[PDB]
Design a protein around this ligand. Structure first.
Ligand SMILES: [Mg+2]
Length: 145
């Protein structure tokens, strides 16, 4: 049993569940970072992260097949001893973040090792996969002025 909660930071402005960060169009691009608060991951195991930034309007993806940007971060993430903790994914300074529009971060977390036995043969045969893909999550959304 596992989950991710995520917090987007756009040009130093952090979103919350209550209130999305507001930024001005940057021209040099908007710096986008996502904090991944993970729960119930397998302790001490290595995972890979794919973060995806989408344009969003009224809690629906505008163009779900055309992400603004995709980040793989450092390429490997280590779970805490408790299975709960935080990782930070940098997207970098992102072009195509436009005035009057909102953007939401989606996250996919996948174990490096097979950790899930799906057929009860006693051997893990599947990677552990956890995601947070919520287009209504203010915590993952920022607004451009
Ligand atoms: Mg198996």
């Amino acid at each position: 049993v596992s989950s991710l909660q995520t917090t987007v930071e756009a040009d130093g402005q952090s979103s919350t569940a209550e209130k999305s960060a507001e930024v001005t169009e940057n021209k040099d691009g908007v710096n986008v970072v996502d904090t991944i608060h993970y729960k119930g991951l397998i302790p001490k195991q290595k995972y890979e992260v794919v973060g995806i930034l989408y344009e969003v309007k009224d809690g629906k993806l505008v163009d779900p097949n055309k992400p603004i940007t995709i980040s793989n971060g450092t390429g490997e993430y280590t779970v805490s001893d408790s299975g709960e903790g935080e990782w930070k994914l940098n997207f970098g300074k992102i072009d195509g973040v436009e005035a009057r529009k909102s953007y939401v971060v989606y996250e996919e977390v996948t174990s490096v090792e097979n950790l899930v036995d799906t057929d009860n043969d006693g051997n893990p045969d599947k990677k552990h996969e956890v995601e947070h893909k919520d287009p209504k999550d203010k915590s993952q959304t920022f607004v451009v002025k």
